[PDB]
């Protein structure tokens, strides 16, 4: 490490500071408790397989990260007392929760895939891998485990990664930006800063304000876990792709240009801000380069717009309206990408029907709340950016009439006519718990 140590790493799960890798494989399961017991013996079969966050900077081929929910602490036994300490938001759900996550319309928990919002996932698990054998030597261990468990059942399996590059569902390197946290041990790559205080991230820790946000009780539970926000989307890429060619007449006839405008980087992960031309692939892929700007040099957009996805998500040095303090509404996401290669020359409507997209593991010692305000806030309005109702590009629910303002010498742009190319297929509301939380709710009685 090249920083000072204050997080029990080795209690804390190794999935909320261990960056996705790169190649990446895996898969996601969801599981539910049929009795109690089942449940228990479950999480105890798996603790030794679940990796904690030491020496998370390290090389490590294979994790499995477990994360529970409302429905699945209650099924486990665990007491009444523990059950009301934990946010409301949490204990209601994510579906439950649709009206503070504007997720409606299309996104509508009723048209969501089962087992999602049922209340049915009390457990998630996933394994990250690095190489395929590692990949199925996890797998292999987690399928065994769960068939030999009475009282359990897989509701559901998907895998993940082995995307060429890997890309995303619409071709853009992914996992590039995300919090540093101070006390990691791990100082920020160039940009990436400030490290947020730890509490932001893990229970038991001071956050931004100096003191511990609220936890769950008792310490063994709550200590050293964090919360999660679960979402799957489905990707409509054959739409994408035909909204990029009808509309790259507003960027020079580029059609790459303006995908870099609507998220904010060329698919390769350059930023605008520091290719704001042409595409620049070696910097992209480079974590000591690309995420080194703040947009000081770029008030206006003509750069990275300001209703661009990544600028909505974190504006950094933006002028806002109303002085809001970023570093209290940050994220931490573990992207992956499933189903088929995105083909960037598909553009019929059958395209739209692969079955292709990206789970998110949204973490924080918040993530309800935080998840609530930039679903709220900073991707389905535009208020804090000065745009009006403009949603973001690319997960915001889309009509043909809104717009979307590309910042242009010497006047700007307003495209519009798109559709959603990221549609909600479900999520969860989930609590990560610490190594020593997992054991002790595999000993409730
Ligand atoms: C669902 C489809 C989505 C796609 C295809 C997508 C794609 C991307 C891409 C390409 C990046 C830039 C590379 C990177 O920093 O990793 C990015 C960044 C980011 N996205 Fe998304 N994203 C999606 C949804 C979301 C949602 C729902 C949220 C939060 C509620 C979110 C939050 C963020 C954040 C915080 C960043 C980093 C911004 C920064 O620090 O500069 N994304 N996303
Ligand atoms: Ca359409
Ligand atoms: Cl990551
Ligand atoms: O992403
Ligand atoms: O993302």
Redesign the pocket.
């Known amino acids: 490490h090249n920083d000072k140590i204050d997080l029990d790493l080795d209690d804390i799960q190794a999935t909320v500071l261990r960056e996705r890798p790169e190649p990446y494989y895996g898969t996601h399961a969801m599981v539910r408790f049929d009795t109690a017991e089942g449940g228990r013996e479950l999480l105890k079969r798996l603790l030794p397989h679940i990796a904690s966050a030491e020496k998370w900077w390290d090389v490590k081929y294979a994790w499995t990260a477990a994360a529970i929910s409302y429905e699945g602490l209650k099924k486990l036994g665990v007491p009444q007392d523990s059950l009301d300490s934990f946010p409301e938001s949490f204990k209601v759900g994510m579906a439950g929760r649709a009206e503070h996550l504007f997720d409606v319309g299309e996104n509508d928990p009723k048209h969501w895939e089962k087992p999602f919002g049922t209340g049915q996932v009390h457990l998630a698990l996933t394994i990250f891998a690095e190489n395929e054998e590692n990949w199925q030597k996890a797998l292999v261990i987690a399928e065994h485990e769960l068939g030999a468990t009475k009282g359990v059942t897989l509701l559901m399996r998907e895998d993940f990664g082995a995307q060429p590059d890997s890309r995303?569902?619409?071709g853009?390197?992914?996992?590039?930006?995300?919090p540093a946290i101070e006390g990691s041990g791990i100082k920020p790559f160039p940009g990436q800063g400030p490290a947020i205080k730890p509490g932001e991230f893990v229970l038991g820790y001071p956050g931004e304000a100096g003191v511990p946000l609220g936890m769950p009780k008792p310490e063994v539970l709550g200590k050293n876990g964090t919360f999660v926000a679960l979402?799957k989307?489905h990707?409509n890429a054959g739409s994408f792709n035909r909204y990029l060619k009808e509309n790259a007449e507003y960027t020079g006839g580029d059609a790459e240009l303006l995908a870099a405008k609507l998220?904010?980087?060329w698919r390769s992960?350059a930023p605008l801000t520091l290719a704001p031309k042409e595409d620049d692939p070696e910097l992209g892929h480079d974590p000591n380069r690309n995420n080194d700007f703040t947009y000081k040099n770029d008030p206006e957009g003509l750069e990275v717009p300001l209703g661009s996805?990544?600028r909505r998500?974190?504006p950094?040095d933006t002028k806002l309206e109303l002085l809001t303090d970023v570093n209290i509404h940050r994220?931490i996401?573990r992207?992956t990408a499933y189903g088929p290669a995105y083909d960037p020359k598909a553009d019929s409507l059958a395209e739209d029907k692969v079955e292709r997209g990206?789970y998110?593991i949204?973490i924080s010692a918040k993530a309800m709340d935080t998840?609530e305000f930039?679903?709220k806030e900073w991707?389905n309005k535009a208020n804090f950016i000065g745009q009006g109702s403009e949603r973001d590009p690319?997960?915001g629910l889309q009509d043909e009439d809104l717009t979307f303002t590309l910042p242009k010498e010497p006047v700007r742009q307003r495209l519009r006519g798109m559709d959603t190319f990221?549609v909600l297929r479900g999520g969860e509301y989930l609590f990560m718990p610490s190594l020593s939380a997992l054991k002790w709710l595999s000993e409730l009685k």
């Not at 853009?172 to 995300?178: E, L, Q, R, T």
């Open positions: 995303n569902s619409l853009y390197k992914d996992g590039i930006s995300n979402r989307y990707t998220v904010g980087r992960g996805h990544i998500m974190n950094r994220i996401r992207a990206l998110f949204f998840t930039l679903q991707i690319i997960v990221n």
